[PDB]
Design a protein around this ligand. Structure first.
Ligand code: CLA
Ligand code: CLA
Ligand code: CLA
Ligand code: CLA
Ligand SMILES: CCCCCCCCCCCCCCCCCC(=O)OC[C@H](CO[C@@H]1O[C@H](CO)[C@H](O)[C@H](O)[C@H]1O)OC(=O)CCCCCCCCCCCCCCCCC
Ligand SMILES: CCCCCCCCCCCCCCCC(=O)OC[C@H](CO[C@@H]1O[C@H](CS(=O)(=O)O)[C@@H](O)[C@H](O)[C@H]1O)OC(=O)CCCCCCCCCCCCCCC
Ligand SMILES: CCCCCCCCCCCCCCCC(=O)OC[C@H](COP(=O)(O)OC[C@@H](O)CO)OC(=O)CCCCCCCCCCCCCCC
Ligand SMILES: CC(=O)O[C@H]1CC(C)(C)C(=C=C/C(C)=C/C=C/C(C)=C/C=C/C=C(C)/C=C/C=C(\C)C(=O)C[C@@]23O[C@]2(C)C[C@@H](O)CC3(C)C)[C@](C)(O)C1
Ligand code: KC1
Ligand SMILES: CC1=C(C#C/C(C)=C/C=C/C(C)=C/C=C/C=C(C)/C=C/C=C(C)/C=C/[C@@]23O[C@]2(C)C[C@@H](O)CC3(C)C)C(C)(C)C[C@H](O)C1
Ligand SMILES: CC1=C(/C=C/C(C)=C/C=C/C(C)=C/C=C/C=C(C)/C=C/C=C(C)/C=C/C2=C(C)CCCC2(C)C)C(C)(C)CCC1
Ligand SMILES: CCCCCCCCCCCCO[C@@H]1O[C@H](CO)[C@@H](O[C@H]2O[C@H](CO)[C@@H](O)[C@H](O)[C@H]2O)[C@H](O)[C@H]1O
Ligand code: SF4
Lengths: 162, 132, 33, 732, 74, 89, 74, 28, 80
């Protein structure tokens, strides 16, 4: 496949990693009696470990000669779950914070003491604003084609140079 | 002085004339003379890496005796610059002209020695031997 | 010759810098120049 | 002035020791000397160029002389695979007996092994004996005497050339392209055809028979008849003992591609043709400007006409002609930027497409050469932006470039800086975060949880050039493509053979470890640029100091007022950037070295797995490869590599003394010296002696420069110590 | 330098195990009189040799010491 | 003198020979140049493909190389023609 | 006091004090246990006495023996 | 490999050193 | 010596003169501002260059300005 990689369910070296990770925890398990808390903890760890290899095998990830999963970010839609889909997710949450935080500064600006409300949050007002950023791509778009997103060039102070 | 002055002509003439006596003395002494253990090195175990040519190859006793004999005449002169007599000749400020014509001639031979060695593949004592 | 490095290296390593450090000292501390 | 600095009346009247320190450090800043005119300035620089040119040829003549006199060039030419090449001999009265035996292993005397690669270079250009090497050194000593006479000759009053001669761009450029670059390239092709090729084929051509021995059987009949195909006929066979006539061709201008099967280097007849094709391009390009013959271009008329009618670039390039000719710092900054790109380009192409016979065999030299040109590339690049800042301070004329392409850069300087800052923050957060995620995941015993992005883009480029290992079938690696069908006949088969051979450097196998380091290298380039571009654009002024241009390029600060102003000058930006150059070249040199040590060691997988997390670098590269270096000397004994071990510690010390000048500031030190001046004046028998220059503590800007030189010299000497002896102590 | 002096002197000349007939085997085997008189000896036998634990602690229970090692270099 | 304002540059930028010339001739010349470049390239490709004509760089011909050099000439001429048309010529 | 009260609390509920008191030459000391959430359980070392935890080096155990502790109740 | 060749090479370096001391005199 | 220049934006509030630790500045009669007084730098040779005067000036940008100059024994601040 891409870059001469093989899928992880068919990699001979990915399977060896699964065995040696389980063998290491089994040889630690043998020094304890079967009902005790260290034996139940290591038994639960080998279940977590065994479920970690099974998950990847059917995942659809690509392995190398090293036996480790690789990620593809060319833009292929077949490997979307690797970068695109968690990427769109992060953009939604990061742009949500920046939008909401900016709404707050603009709101408390027209006031006697704007600086007072940055060290001591008006929580009822802040709480209201935080959840209005769920539709930010629409709200950031309405202000771009209004004139309320970016200011004019005669409103920004500039260094003597330019 | 410090250049082509009259003084520097007088001092270097006095070194040439003294130098001819040093070259002719060896010429008599390396050329069938009493130099002992002339061509055998010093000891690395005794003198060290100061005495070596390359690796541990040490200078011979011939080269050491001649170099140390030059340091005998050097050090006593070095006194005469640093603590000169109130009546002596000063640096860095049968009685006459006789120095100025011998000491010219004595400076003329040494350069004509070095011509007569770079041509004939002959060390400087063989040409003094040919001149006797 | 094969005898040259035992002549130049004290001259270049000890003698030349002692003359050069002496010369610069006299020049740097000379008032009208 | 009548004091030691005779060029600064204001530095010569200083009673403190600072006067001595400054007269040294401002001696070359020619524009700032007392009573300097413009015509005298250009003349002093010109004669300074001759003396600089002579030092280079005296330096070269040295290297030729020491190998001819003390090397093993003749023994190396006979067996270039087994003998180690000889830099020069050692004579040090401080050596024990075991030192003389340790540095003379395999020879007769104490000696340094060369890692410059002059041997491989001289071998492929024709040299075969010590007599030829010695003759070449005499010719460069004579050339240096001529350059030292010319420098003096052009200071004479009848030979001092006028101000308008120095500003004739159209002539100078014409002569430099066609004559300095074209005819030199042409002459170099003549040397390859007459001396170089014949010597690779077992034929000796020297100064005594080059006029009666033609370099090709045809003998210039094919050249004047247009039959240029005869010079490509009958090239070297596949099994040709190099340096002998066994399997020798007759061709002088080929286009084979790839490498010679025996030396693993480029074909000499490919290089000859390359130098010739290049010679024709530079000779033709040198006929573009008008120089008292009517035909040609006027540079000023070109620049004034280039303003796109869309109006996006403002007034375009009007005024740039005056600003470049009337300022040497802009010229110097453009020249340093192109040389820094060029010497960086030579570091990448030399390790991949080895041009000299037997290169990439002597593992140490390859490691010495690549890191030598990358560190020099860093100084040149940093010096380009440093002189770009100096231009804005004392050379930029705002009224001359109204609405110019240069003026508009200052008009949105906040945009460039703020955006360069974003890219840097982005690369830093993610590249550092990914490395740390891989570290904790492996530390916990779950290395199957690592985030290893595959470098698809670089692999695609490799596949397009012919690499058939990523199974991409794109371009040159797909047989039914017009790019590869046109390429098969002329040079494709030699290139494909060389590009698919594993034991090479042509497009190394890259993995997800090669992907993380590249983003670190990216981060290094962006932050370094951020500091240099911010320093150039804010050189004339900022919000915190709107009249910065009034104080010049370098000054301490603006005091502790309005908050405090340490490191506000444009010179300070350069000083801060130095740390980044050293750091981003260090990330490049560690990466290039570690990747090769594992290919040579025979286990390329070691770097492919450990390069994902940081501990891998710290343990499998630094801790694992320092063994033979620090065992150079110990209680049991010492080895040949003792000097590198001593130099290794040496570097650590100078680097650490650099911290003293960078952390502890001046008014601590000034108060201390005042007690020392007191003590000396009160002690009997030491009172007879007295200083003529009042001892004072180094100044604010002087402490930064010194602390910087220690951090720098310590930084470079300790890596040189590591990279040379870890490779030569393992040889693979 | 105090804690470096204490950590190395105790490991070279006190700390260790024994067997029959009082055969003392020290931790670093008595390398203190001939390896700490030079900087290279301090750099190679104390810092380089005794680093092997913290740099090879991955996958073990003392792997937090390997992470805090890098974290504090950062 | 070279600097210009407005939608199109003055005729003088083209050069002494070009400014005198009419837009139509320039456009026709540019088209001819383009035709020559493409044909030459195609012929060279055919020669490269052909057996017995590509050995030892025999495929390269002087005229085809001239046409290849001529592609840039075709672009410049078309730009010049546009400028001439703009200056009512 | 809050700091001291914590330590004694950890020695009574997250330690191997009893197993250490019976054989203080083979059982290693430990008064800290980590939660298993992101693969970090590996920090619970195999210390001894049917117990897994982080090895602590404060000497709480030795100080308790010298006081004559012997029981977690105390 | 010849001793006389070495002697010739440092006479030219002595002439070169003289032109350098003379070139600097003039730059000052 | 150092150079101390005084611009016309000086409002004459005497704060630079009260901050100078080596008596370089003084107040003189002037008819261009409310206080009818401007700062002046008659003894710049005692100027040590510590810039305390600029830390005291209330105008934006500063009315008083210190520029680095050739150093004597007085501006180096030496007691020996
Ligand atoms: C390689 C370098 C070198 C050499 C070989 C010399 C050689 C000489 N220099 Mg000299 N010089 C040199 C470099 C050198 N220079 C340099 C670089 C400088 C610095 C610029 C000087 C500065 C300098 C000065 C200023 C002077 C010399 C003088 C001399 C001469 C001293 C010879 C002498 O007194 O005995 C030969 C002359 C005699 C009168 C012999 C007297 C015999 C005495 C009594 C000893 C005999 C006793 C006998 C052995 C028995 C021992 C008795 C015991 C057992 C009790 C000689 C020409 C001095 C000179 O020319 O005046 C003599 C002098 O004044 N030099
Ligand atoms: C044909 C005539 C000719 C020639 C050969 C030269 C030669 C030279 N002139 Mg010169 N000059 C000429 C005519 C000529 N000049 C005329 C007519 C004028 C007056 C109008 C001048 C005015 C002049 C001045 C004012 C100065 C010089 C200087 C120099 C020297 C440059 C330094 C040097 O050695 O670089 C040698 C460089 C090379 C051999 C080339 C190096 C390779 C470079 C980096 C090219 C890169 C290769 C390639 C293109 C890279 C592209 C790859 C890409 C992917 C990046 C050089 C000796 C300077 C000097 O030093 O004065 C003594 C100087 O200051 N000249
Ligand atoms: C880029 C041009 C160039 C360069 C750099 C070299 C360099 C070299 N040639 Mg060379 N050569 C060239 C062009 C060049 N050649 C041409 C065009 C021919 C005619 C085909 C030759 C024919 C040739 C022969 C027969 C030999 C060399 C040899 C050499 C080597 C040492 C000889 C030497 O030049 O020392 C002295 C260097 C100088 C005196 C500096 C030259 C000064 C320049 C500025 C000339 C003056 C410029 C302007 C005209 C005024 C050296 C590798 C020798 C060799 O390779 O030994 C094995 C040798 O035997 N060359
Ligand atoms: C062809 C290249 C070139 C040229 C012509 C110049 C020319 C100039 N530069 Mg410049 N520069 C260059 C490259 C160049 N530079 C590069 C590559 C950088 C990046 C490092 C810089 C960075 C730079 C700065 C930051 C400044 C200049 C300045 C200057 C001007 C005065 C220089 C001066 O007084 O030096 C005086 C000479 C010295 C102080 C000698 C310094 C020696 C250094 C410290 C190294 C010595 C350490 C030693 C090697 C250690 C030995 C180690 C051993 C023990 C093992 C002058 C016009 C200065 C200026 O005032 O311009 C207006 C200025 O501020 N340049
Ligand atoms: C190359 C260009 C050559 C042009 C010559 C000079 C042109 C000139 O001077 O004025 C240029 C003139 C046009 O005149 C235009 O007038 C403008 C008015 O503002 C301008 O002022 C200029 O004068 C000009 O641009 O060109 C022509 O009118 C004729 C074009 C020439 C035709 C060439 C194409 C040939 C097509 C093939 C025909 C085959 C038919 C035969 C088939 C039958 C059986 C086979
Ligand atoms: C394709 C077109 C080819 C050009 C045909 C030649 C035109 C006449 C030449 C000429 O000088 O007049 C035209 C003017 C010169 O007269 C110029 O005339 C100008 C005004 S005017 O033309 O007299 O009106 C005047 O300003 C200027 O001083 C004067 O030099 O310059 C040109 O336009 C010529 C263009 C470039 C020609 C250079 C030839 C190079 C030789 C090639 C060698 C290669 C070998 C391998
Ligand atoms: C990118 C960073 C590179 C390093 C910086 C170096 C400077 C490079 C910048 C110079 C070029 C600037 C071009 C933009 C600014 C710009 O071009 O505006 C100006 C430019 C030409 O306008 P002029 O000012 O020349 O006006 C001419 C007209 O007035 C006609 O008389 O517009 C163009 O059409 C350029 C050519 C095609 C432009 C578009 C076609 C290209 C297609 C690209 C695909 C787009 C992606 C689509 C995805 C769906
Ligand atoms: C009488 C009259 O009115 O006529 C009318 C006719 C008509 C048709 C109606 C009109 C029109 C419109 C016209 C004429 C439009 C013309 C448009 C035109 C002609 C546009 C060319 C672009 C050329 C390019 C981009 C060249 C690139 C060349 C490139 C990118 C190269 O690098 C070439 C080269 O790399 C090769 C390939 C390889 C090497 O071997 C050589 C080198 C390296 C150099 C006019 C104007 O109205 C006039
Ligand atoms: C080795 C020791 C040596 C001594 C000790 C010595 C001493 C004197 N030489 Mg002399 N010398 C040589 C060596 C020595 N010379 C040699 C090798 C040559 C041939 C090249 C020679 C050349 C000439 C000439 C041409 C003249 C001359 C003189 C005197 C003179 C007293 C002058 C006076 O005060 O009257 C004295 C004391 C001049 C002269 O005799 O004037 C009447 C005079 O013209 N020499
Ligand atoms: C003027 C003129 C012309 C001329 C001319 C001429 C003839 C110029 C000649 C110049 C000449 C002939 C310059 C020699 C110097 C020799 C010196 C300084 C000797 C030093 C020797 C000394 C100081 C002694 C050294 C030693 O003592 C040491 C230190 C230890 C001993 O072990 C070894 C010796 C004894 C050796 C032209 C060319 C015709 C042009 C025009 O027409 C007229
Ligand atoms: C500040 C300043 C300055 C400086 C600047 C600088 C220093 C810069 C740099 C810059 C740089 C340093 C740049 C670089 C660039 C580069 C480039 C731009 C490249 C290009 C490339 C391309 C375009 C392409 C390529 C290719 C080809 C050709 C083919 C094959 C493939 C490819 C595609 C790759 C100055 C002096 C002006 C002055 C003012 C100020
Ligand atoms: C700052 C000072 C630095 C400059 C130092 C330079 C030293 C100059 C040395 C020049 C040598 C002159 O001295 C003379 O040289 C010639 C040159 O063959 C030697 O002649 C030599 O001939 C052959 C070499 O072909 C040798 O095998 C033989 O042993 C020797 O006699 C003389 O024996 C020597 O006395
Ligand atoms: S310069 Fe400043 S401190 Fe001095 S009088 Fe003017 S406003 Fe006041």
């Amino acid at each position: 496949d891409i870059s001469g990689l093989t899928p992880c369910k068919e990699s001979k070296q990915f399977a060896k990693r699964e065995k040696q990770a389980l063998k290491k925890l089994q040889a630690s398990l043998k020094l304890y009696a079967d009902d005790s808390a260290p034996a139940l903890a290591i038994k639960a760890t080998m279940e977590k470990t065994k479920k970690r290899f099974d998950n990847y095998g059917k995942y659809g990830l690509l392995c190398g000669s090293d036996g480790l999963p690789h990620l593809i970010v060319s833009g292929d839609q077949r490997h979307w779950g690797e970068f695109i889909t968690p990427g769109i997710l992060f953009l939604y949450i990061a742009g949500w914070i920046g939008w909401v935080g900016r709404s707050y500064l603009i709101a408390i600006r027209d006031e006697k003491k704007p600086t007072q409300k940055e060290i001591i949050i008006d929580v009822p007002l802040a709480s209201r604003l935080l959840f209005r950023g769920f539709s930010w791509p629409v709200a950031a778009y309405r202000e771009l084609l209004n004139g309320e997103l970016v200011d004019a060039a005669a409103a920004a102070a500039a260094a003597a140079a330019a | 002085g410090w250049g082509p002055s009259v003084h520097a002509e007088k001092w270097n003439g006095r070194h040439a004339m003294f130098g001819w006596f040093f070259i002719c003395c060896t010429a008599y002494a390396k050329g069938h003379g009493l130099i002992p253990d002339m061509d055998v090195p010093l000891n690395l175990k005794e003198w060290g890496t100061l005495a070596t040519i390359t690796g541990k190859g040490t200078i011979t006793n011939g080269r050491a005796v001649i170099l140390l004999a030059n340091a005998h005449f050097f050090a006593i002169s070095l006194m005469a610059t640093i603590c000169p007599l109130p009546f002596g000749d000063s640096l860095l400020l049968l009685t006459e002209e006789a120095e100025m014509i011998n000491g010219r001639l004595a400076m003329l031979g040494l350069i004509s020695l070095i011509f007569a060695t770079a041509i004939e593949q002959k060390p400087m004592l063989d040409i003094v031997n040919e001149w006797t | 010759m094969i005898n040259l490095p035992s002549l130049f290296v004290p001259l270049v390593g000890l003698l030349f810098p002692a003359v050069a450090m002496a010369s610069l000292f006299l020049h740097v501390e000379k008032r009208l120049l | 002035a009548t004091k030691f600095p005779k060029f600064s009346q204001a530095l010569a009247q200083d009673p403190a020791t600072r006067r001595i320190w400054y007269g040294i450090a401002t001696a070359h800043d020619l524009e700032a000397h007392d009573g300097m005119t413009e015509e005298n300035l250009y003349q002093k620089i010109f004669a300074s160029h001759f003396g600089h040119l002579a030092i280079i040829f005296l330096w070269t003549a040295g290297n030729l002389f020491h190998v001819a006199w003390q090397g093993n060039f003749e023994q190396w030419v006979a067996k270039p695979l087994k003998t180690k090449p000889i830099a020069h001999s050692i004579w040090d009265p401080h050596f024990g007996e075991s030192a003389l035996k340790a540095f003379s292993k395999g020879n007769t005397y104490p000696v340094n092994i060369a890692f410059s690669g002059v041997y491989q270079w001289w071998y492929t250009i024709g040299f075969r004996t010590n007599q030829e090497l010695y003759a070449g050194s005499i010719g460069l000593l004579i050339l240096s005497c001529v350059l030292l006479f010319a420098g003096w000759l052009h200071l004479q009053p009848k030979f001092r050339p006028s101000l308008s001669w120095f500003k004739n761009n159209e002539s100078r450029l014409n002569h430099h392209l066609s004559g300095l670059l074209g005819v030199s390239s042409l002459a170099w092709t003549g040397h390859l055809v007459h001396v170089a090729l014949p010597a690779s084929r077992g034929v000796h051509i020297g100064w005594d028979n080059f006029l009666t021995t033609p370099p090709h059987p045809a003998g210039l009949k094919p050249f004047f008849t247009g039959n240029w195909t005869v010079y490509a006929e009958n090239p070297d066979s596949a099994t040709h003992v190099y340096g002998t006539s066994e399997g020798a061709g007759t061709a002088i201008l080929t286009f084979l591609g790839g490498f010679h099967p025996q030396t693993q280097s480029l074909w000499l007849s490919d290089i000859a043709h390359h130098q010739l094709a290049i010679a024709v391009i530079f000779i033709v390009a040198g006929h573009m400007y008008r120089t008292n013959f009517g035909i040609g271009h006027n540079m000023k008329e070109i620049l004034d006409a280039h303003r796109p009618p869309g109006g996006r670039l403002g007034a375009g390039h009007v005024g740039l002609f005056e600003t470049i000719t009337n300022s040497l710092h802009m010229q110097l900054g453009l020249a340093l930027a192109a040389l820094g790109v060029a010497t960086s380009l030579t570091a990448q192409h030399m390790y991949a497409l080895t041009p000299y016979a037997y290169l990439s065999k002597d593992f140490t030299t390859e490691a010495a050469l690549y890191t030598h040109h990358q560190y020099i590339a860093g100084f040149l690049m940093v010096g380009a932006f440093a002189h770009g800042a100096i231009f804005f301070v004392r050379d930029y004329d705002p009224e001359l470039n109204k609405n110019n392409v240069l003026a508009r850069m200052l008009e949105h300087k906040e945009a460039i800086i703020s955006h360069l800052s974003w890219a840097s923050l982005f690369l830093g957060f993610h590249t550092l975060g990914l490395y740390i995620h891989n570290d904790t995941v492996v530390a916990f015993g779950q290395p199957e949880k690592q985030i290893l992005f595959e470098p698809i883009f670089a692999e695609y480029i490799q596949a397009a050039s012919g690499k058939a290992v990523y199974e991409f079938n794109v371009l040159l690696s797909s047989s039914s493509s017009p790019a590869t069908v046109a390429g098969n006949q002329v040079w494709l088969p030699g290139w494909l053979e060389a590009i698919n051979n594993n034991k090479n450097d042509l497009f190394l196998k890259i993995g997800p470890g090669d992907f993380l380091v590249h983003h670190a290298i990216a981060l290094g380039l962006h932050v370094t640029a951020l500091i240099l571009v911010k320093g150039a654009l804010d050189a004339r002024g900022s919000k915190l100091m709107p009249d910065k241009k009034d104080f010049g390029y370098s000054f301490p600060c603006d005091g502790p007022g309005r908050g405090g102003t340490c490191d506000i000058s444009a010179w300070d930006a350069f000083y801060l950037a130095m740390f980044w150059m050293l750091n981003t070249i260090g990330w490049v040199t560690f990466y290039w070295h570690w990747k090769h040590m594992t290919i040579w060691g025979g286990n390329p997988g070691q770097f492919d797995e450990s390069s994902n997390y940081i501990m891998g670098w710290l343990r499998d590269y630094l801790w694992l490869n320092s063994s033979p270096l620090i065992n150079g000397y110990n209680p049991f004994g010492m080895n040949n590599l003792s000097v590198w071990a001593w130099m290794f510690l040496f570097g650590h010390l100078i680097w650490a003394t650099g911290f003293m000048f960078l952390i502890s500031w001046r008014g601590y030190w000034q108060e201390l010296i005042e007690t020392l001046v007191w003590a000396h004046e009160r002690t009997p028998l030491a009172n007879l002696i007295r200083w003529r220059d009042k001892p004072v503590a180094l100044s604010i800007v002087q402490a930064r420069l010194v602390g910087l030189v220690h951090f720098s010299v310590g930084y470079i000497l300790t890596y040189a110590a590591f990279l040379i002896a870890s490779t030569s102590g393992k040889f693979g | 330098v105090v804690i470096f002096h204490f950590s190395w002197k105790m490991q070279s000349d006190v700390w260790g195990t024994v067997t029959a007939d009082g055969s003392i085997s020290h931790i670093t085997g008595g390398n203190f009189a001939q390896s700490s008189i030079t900087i290279n000896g301090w750099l190679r036998d104390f810092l380089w040799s005794q680093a092997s634990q913290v740099i090879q602690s991955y996958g073990s229970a003392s792997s937090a010491y390997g992470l805090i090692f890098l974290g504090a270099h950062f | 003198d070279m600097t210009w304002e407005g939608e199109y540059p003055p005729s003088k930028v083209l050069g002494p020979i070009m400014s005198k010339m009419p837009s139509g001739l320039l456009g026709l010349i540019s088209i001819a140049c383009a035709a020559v470049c493409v044909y030459s390239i195609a012929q060279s490709g055919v020669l490269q493909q052909q057996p017995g004509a590509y050995e030892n760089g025999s495929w390269v011909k002087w005229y085809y190389v001239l046409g290849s050099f001529g592609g840039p000439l075709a672009w410049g001429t078309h730009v010049a023609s546009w400028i001439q048309r703009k200056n009512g010529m | 006091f809050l700091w001291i009260s914590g330590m004694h609390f950890h020695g009574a509920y997250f330690s191997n004090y009893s197993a250490w008191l019976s054989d203080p030459i083979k059982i290693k000391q430990s008064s800290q246990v980590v939660w298993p959430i992101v693969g970090q359980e590996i920090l619970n070392a195999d210390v001894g006495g049917n117990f897994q935890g982080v090895q602590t080096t404060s000497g709480w155990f030795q100080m308790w023996r010298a006081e004559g502790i012997t029981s977690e109740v105390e | 490999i010849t001793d006389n060749q070495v002697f010739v090479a440092l006479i030219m370096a002595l002439v070169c050193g003289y032109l350098a001391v003379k070139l600097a005199k003039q730059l000052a | 010596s150092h150079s101390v220049k005084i611009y016309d934006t000086c409002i004459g509030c005497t704060q630079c003169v009260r901050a100078c630790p080596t008596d370089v500045l003084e107040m003189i009669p002037w008819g261009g501002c409310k206080a009818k007084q401007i700062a002046s730098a008659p003894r710049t040779e005692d100027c040590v260059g510590c810039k305390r005067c600029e830390s005291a000036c209330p105008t934006d940008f500063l009315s008083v300005r210190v520029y680095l100059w050739h150093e004597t024994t007085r501006s180096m601040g030496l007691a020996y």
